[PDB]
Design a protein around this ligand. Structure first.
Ligand SMILES: N#Cc1ccc2c(-c3cc4cc(CN5CCC(CN)CC5)ccc4[nH]3)n[nH]c2c1
Length: 272
């Protein structure tokens, strides 16, 4: 009905990437803001097609909302939820981290999103601060499903084998075994994100015996650089998440029962 509702203006560039760029778009009439992921297909047909399919089946408060997409020649346009607060990455002070109560709150929200995804059979495969966005009220939302895939269909689990992710956040089994369960891998990456939030640094370049940092952790030398800055309660949770054997690694239902996870720390928003 309203004559100019379909027109959007490109205000600025939110972030560039290998496949393309994401820009802020504002509705001409309503001034509603949305992020537009512009991926130049000419440079991937297979990748982007799957990303749209996965986005179409997602609906959760801790997952970046999908509004739709447009073909238009050889350029895909993904209309997504605009998260005013930016990336979690920018809330992590180098070598410091952030206040423990804020990290706990962000972690709770991250667990909520991951539980949702896993419940519908999808694994993200690239969880890291750069892909965890914040809205106006600092609510965390999982974004970028370009590397995501379905690991459970018709109630039957499919073991994964493709090398996906970012080295500092990837689980050790991804580098050691041919096949592996999807869920423990996302749990591990959430553990590395927690470490980053509480220490402002990544523990190792990759989870392999060759990395001195990784071997030290296995030998329980928690008096070293990253771990010494954390505090026993959350550190005990990390000891359960960053376990090399994925079969022995803590599951999300048990993380929800962890002492630190349920420790009162935060305070609500001043004057709601
Ligand atoms: N999939 C996906 C997907 C990727 C990114 C985004 C964003 C996004 C990125 C971003 C970056 C900054 C911080 N910047 C903005 C740019 C400015 C320079 N022009 C410097 C400060 C502030 C707000 C903000 N919001 N919202 N939704 C999605 C979905």
């Amino acid at each position: 009905a309203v004559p100019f509702v379909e027109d959007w203006d490109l205000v600025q560039t939110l972030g560039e990437g290998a496949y393309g760029e994401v820009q802020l778009a504002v509705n001409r009439v309503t001034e509603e803001a949305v992020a537009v992921k512009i991926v130049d297909m000419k440079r991937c047909p297979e990748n982007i097609k799957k990303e749209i399919c996965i986005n179409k089946m997602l609906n959760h408060e801790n997952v970046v909302k999908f509004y739709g997409h447009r073909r238009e020649g050889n350029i895909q346009y993904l209309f997504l939820e605009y998260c005013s607060g930016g990336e979690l990455f920018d809330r992590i002070e180098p070598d410091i981290g952030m206040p423990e109560p804020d990290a706990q709150r962000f972690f709770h929200q991250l667990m909520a999103g991951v539980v949702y995804l896993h419940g519908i059979g999808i694994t993200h495969r690239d969880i890291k601060p750069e892909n965890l966005l914040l809205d106006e009220r600092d609510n965390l939302k999982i974004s970028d499903f370009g590397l995501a895939t379905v690991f459970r269909y018709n109630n039957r689990e499919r073991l994964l084998n493709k090398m996906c992710g970012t080295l500092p956040y990837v689980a050790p089994e991804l580098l050691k075994r041919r096949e592996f369960h999807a869920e423990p891998v996302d749990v591990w990456s959430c553990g590395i994100v927690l470490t980053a939030m509480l220490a402002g640094e990544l523990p190792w370049d990759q989870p392999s015996d060759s990395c001195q940092e990784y071997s030290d952790w296995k030998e329980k030398k928690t008096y070293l650089n990253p771990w010494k800055k954390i505090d026993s309660a959350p550190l005990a949770l990390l000891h359960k998440i960053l376990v090399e054997n994925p079969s022995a690694r803590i599951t999300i239902p048990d993380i929800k029962k962890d002492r630190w996870y349920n420790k009162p720390l935060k305070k609500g928003a001043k004057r709601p």
